[PDB]
Amino acid sequence: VPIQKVQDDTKTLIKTIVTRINDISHTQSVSSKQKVTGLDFIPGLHPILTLSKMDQTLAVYQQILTSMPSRNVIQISNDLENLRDLLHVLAFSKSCHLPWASGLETLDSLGGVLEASGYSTEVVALSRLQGSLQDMLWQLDLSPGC
Amino acid sequence: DVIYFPPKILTSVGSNVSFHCIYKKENKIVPSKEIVWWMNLAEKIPQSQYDVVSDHVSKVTFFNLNETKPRGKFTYDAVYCCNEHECHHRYAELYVIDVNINISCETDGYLTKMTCRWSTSTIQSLAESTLQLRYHRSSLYCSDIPSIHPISEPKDCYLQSDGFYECIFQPIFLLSGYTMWIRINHSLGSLDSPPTCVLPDSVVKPLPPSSVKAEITINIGLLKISWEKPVFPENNLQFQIRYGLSGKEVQWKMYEVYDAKSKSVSLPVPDLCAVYAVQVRCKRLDGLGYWSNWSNPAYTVVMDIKVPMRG
Amino acid sequence: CETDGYLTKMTCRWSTSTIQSLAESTLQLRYHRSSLYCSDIPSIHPISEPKDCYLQSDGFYECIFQPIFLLSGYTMWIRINHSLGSLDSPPTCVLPDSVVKPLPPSSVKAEITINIGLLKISWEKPVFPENNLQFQIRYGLSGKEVQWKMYEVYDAKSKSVSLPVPDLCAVYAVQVRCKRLDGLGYWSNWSNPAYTVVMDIKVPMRG
Numbered sequence: 001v002p003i004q005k006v007q008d009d010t011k012t013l014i015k016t017i018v019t020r021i022n023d024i025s026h027t028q029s030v031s032s033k034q035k036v037t038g039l040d041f042i043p044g045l046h047p048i049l050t051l052s053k054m055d056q057t058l059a060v061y062q063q064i065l066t067s068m069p070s071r072n073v074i075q076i077s078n079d080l081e082n083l084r085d086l087l088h089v090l091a092f093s094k095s096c097h098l099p100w101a102s103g104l105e106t107l108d109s110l111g112g113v114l115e116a117s118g119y120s121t122e123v124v125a126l127s128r129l130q131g132s133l134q135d136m137l138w139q140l141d142l143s144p145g146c
Numbered sequence: 147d148v149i150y151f152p153p154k155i156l157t158s159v160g161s162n163v164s165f166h167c168i169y170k171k172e173n174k175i176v177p178s179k180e181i182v183w184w185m186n187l188a189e190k191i192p193q194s195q196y197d198v199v200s201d202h203v204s205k206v207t208f209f210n211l212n213e214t215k216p217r218g219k220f221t222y223d224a225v226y227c228c229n230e231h232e233c234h235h236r237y238a239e240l241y242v243i244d245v246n247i248n249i250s251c252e253t254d255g256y257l258t259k260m261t262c263r264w265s266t267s268t269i270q271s272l273a274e275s276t277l278q279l280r281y282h283r284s285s286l287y288c289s290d291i292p293s294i295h296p297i298s299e300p301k302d303c304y305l306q307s308d309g310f311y312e313c314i315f316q317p318i319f320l321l322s323g324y325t326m327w328i329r330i331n332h333s334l335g336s337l338d339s340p341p342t343c344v345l346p347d348s349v350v351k352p353l354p355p356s357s358v359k360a361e362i363t364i365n366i367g368l369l370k371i372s373w374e375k376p377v378f379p380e381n382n383l384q385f386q387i388r389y390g391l392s393g394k395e396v397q398w399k400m401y402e403v404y405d406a407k408s409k410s411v412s413l414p415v416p417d418l419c420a421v422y423a424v425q426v427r428c429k430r431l432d433g434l435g436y437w438s439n440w441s442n443p444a445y446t447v448v449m450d451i452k453v454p455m456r457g
Numbered sequence: 458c459e460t461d462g463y464l465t466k467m468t469c470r471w472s473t474s475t476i477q478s479l480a481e482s483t484l485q486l487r488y489h490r491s492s493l494y495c496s497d498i499p500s501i502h503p504i505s506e507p508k509d510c511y512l513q514s515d516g517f518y519e520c521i522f523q524p525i526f527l528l529s530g531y532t533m534w535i536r537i538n539h540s541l542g543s544l545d546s547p548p549t550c551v552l553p554d555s556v557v558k559p560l561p562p563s564s565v566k567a568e569i570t571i572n573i574g575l576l577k578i579s580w581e582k583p584v585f586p587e588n589n590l591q592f593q594i595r596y597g598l599s600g601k602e603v604q605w606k607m608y609e610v611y612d613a614k615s616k617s618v619s620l621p622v623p624d625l626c627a628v629y630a631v632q633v634r635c636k637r638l639d640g641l642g643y644w645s646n647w648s649n650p651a652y653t654v655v656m657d658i659k660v661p662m663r664g
């Protein structure tokens with residue numbers, strides 16, 4: 001398959017994920033940065049410039065969403081897995097091998113965080129995901145390096 | 147790190163609530179002069195609703211609060227307090243219940259049973275809550291509501307196919323005030339709807355008169371309608387007549403008579419031999435009570451009235 | 458098959474009309490998942506997962522996939538099982554993104570332009586998909602029977618279009634349909650019909 005087709009499919013999936021996130025009633029006006037002190041393991045804030053950190057962020061987001069039983073969350077996780085596969089294919093296309101890296105190993109307190117602020121543990125996280133998704137598109141409009 | 151009190155609030159629509167919060171960060175207690183409040187992390191509460199009660203304790207108040215629509219598995223709103231930009235993840239939950247419910251009771255014509263119904267379509271705000279009736283019996287009929295009566299006892303109702311909870315009162319007293327209300331009753335406490343008093347005589351539904359018969363008067367050109375007054379109620383009241391030329395669809399036109407002691411009325415019709423459908427309703431003058439159902443259709447006979455002028 | 462307009466489910470069927478002549482065998486569906494794309498040179502798959510889905514009244518086996526993945530190819534086939542052996546139908550590879558059925562356009566309006574004499578129609582694109590779309594409009598004079606006329610729009614960014622009509626004192630009915638620009642998809646449903654209003658447009662011509 002041509003690289004242009006892969007990039008177009010990636011952009012279409014990006015826009016579809018953004019639209020799906022925007023349809024959630026919880027995320028109506030939440031912004032995309034925040035300064036929640038108790039939520040710091042969630043990726044965001046500082047920008048991403050490399051494919052390894054970007055895959056790490058995707059894996060962390062997938063692990064964050066794994067702890068939710070909503071159908072929309074499951075669909076978003078599947079779309080994120082497809083996006084990760086597309087990103088891996090794109091990275092391999094540029095002769096830069098990207099090894100498969102899992103999420104953070106010390107996310108146990110995350111569970112505790114949930115039992116403290118489950119609602120929040122969702123809402124801001126979802127918003128942050130959307131924020132990253134926006135930068136997602138921008139990060140593919142500047143021809144990023146390996 | 148941050149403490150809120152009270153943590154659980156259960157209030158009805160239109161009331162006012164207050165919250166307090168104490169915040170600590172970086173091994174230091176932030177002064178209460180820099181505390182700002184957020185609702186659901188979406189809208190910013192104006193400063194004009196803020197209050198200071200201690201050197202490091204904040205206070206917020208809510209005016210004309212609104213119905214909390216459910217969103218997903220969550221069915222409550224979160225209130226946050228924090229300084230400047232950094233805010234803790236802990237939240238205080240607020241519950242709002244629409245307590246107003248319309249309950250409709252009708253007295254049967256026999257003055258023996260009360261048919262009482264009400265709908266539960268307004269309960270969608272918060273589910274899994276107990277709804278229970280409560281009616282207070284008074285020897286004297288209901289009057290201006292002084293206050294909530296401490297004495298109360300319950301009575302159950304069942305659910306039919308229409309989704310409206312229904313229960314029947316029997317026996318009943320003609321001149322006893324039944325001050326009734328509904329109560330929502332949840333793991334967090336209870337809330338009581340505004341009460342209502344119903345006079346048994348006021349909401350009586352008269353039995354529909356039967357045995358109506360219409361005829362065309364001979365050599366008079368008028369319509370004669372005969373029937374008998376219904377047994378219940380025995381008070382004075384007016385009658386409504388609706389008649390037309392019988393068919394698949396009939397163009398009715400109303401008529402009213404306000405004399406209770408009156409038995410029959412006379413009224414000419416342009417047509418001479420036409421089959422007619424005539425119906426009568428029965429209702430008290432002053433407006434109290436409910437309209438009765440339509441009676442059986444009464445038909446006429448086709449037969450010559452008078453001598454033709456032009457042969 | 459195809460995918461729902463909301464991109465939440467993908468549902469299809471096969472035929473058994475001509476196969477009904479050869480009965481007494483058992484039929485079941487096997488599906489296999491690829492990584493990103495279905496295939497380029499298909500080969501026999503040794504691993505498959507049976508799917509249990511029911512039968513519909515009209516004679517077509519309704520079968521529903523949920524949840525699905527937008528950019529993952531499915532290789533599906535049906536196995537015929539006779540009392541003496543088994544056989545496999547030729548496999549078919551399907552991409553759910555290429556069989557998306559868009560929703561009909563919403564909030565379609567039509568009006569006669571003032572002091573212009575042209576009929577203008579406006580519409581809003583559906584939320585899904587997020588790709589370029591083409592529109593086909595169809596309109597005529599309202600009545601028991603209508604001699605409509607088709608028109609096509611090949612611009613995705615366009616939302617309003619004006620066309621001329623011979624008559625200027627009649628009620629017109631307008632409908633719109635949308636499709637993927639690349640052609641990898643099906644046709645949508647016809648939009649909600651919109652009826653214009655009867656009113657003056659220009660000054661009287663002659664006394």
Ligand SMILES: *[C@@H]1O[C@H](CO[C@@H]2O[C@@H](C)[C@@H](O)[C@@H](O)[C@@H]2O)[C@@H](O[C@@H]2O[C@H](CO)[C@@H](O)[C@H](O)[C@H]2NC(C)=O)[C@H](O)[C@H]1NC(C)=O
Nearest residue numbers: 157158159160161162163164194195196207208209210211
């Ligand atoms: C809840 O509080 C309101 C007060 O709202 C405001 O209160 C002040 C801060 C000031 O800004 C007022 O102008 C606002 O109305 C109560 O509304 C008033 O309550 C008083 C006390 O009973 C009454 O005399 C007024 O008539 C009320 N105002 C109106 C327009 O009717 C309201 O009653 C409180 N809720 C409950 C359940 O008591």
Ligand SMILES: *[C@@H]1O[C@H](CO)[C@@H](O)[C@H](O)[C@H]1NC(C)=O
Nearest residue numbers: 189208209210211212213214
């Ligand atoms: C409740 O909703 C109504 C809807 O118009 C609005 O006018 C009112 O301001 C709302 N109340 C609050 C406290 O936001």
Ligand SMILES: *[C@@H]1O[C@H](CO)[C@@H](O)[C@H](O)[C@H]1NC(C)=O
Nearest residue numbers: 276278330331332333335336
């Ligand atoms: C209503 O709630 C009260 C708690 O105040 C409880 O005692 C009572 O049993 C409840 N009624 C029910 C469960 O019917």
Ligand SMILES: *[C@@H]1O[C@H](CO)[C@@H](O)[C@H](O)[C@H]1NC(C)=O
Nearest residue numbers: 252351354436437438439440
């Ligand atoms: C009598 O009238 C009431 C109110 O119009 C209606 O609900 C009821 O069904 C009627 N009774 C019959 C037997 O139709």
Ligand SMILES: *[C@@H]1O[C@H](CO)[C@@H](O)[C@H](O)[C@H]1NC(C)=O
Nearest residue numbers: 483537538539540541542543
């Ligand atoms: C094929 O059909 C025969 C019927 O004799 C049955 O015994 C066998 O189990 C079937 N094979 C499979 C894989 O279902």
Ligand SMILES: *[C@@H]1O[C@H](CO)[C@@H](O)[C@H](O)[C@H]1NC(C)=O
Nearest residue numbers: 462559560561645646647648
């Ligand atoms: C589309 O039109 C068909 C008519 O064949 C109808 O069955 C279907 O429900 C319609 N779908 C939508 C989303 O309007």
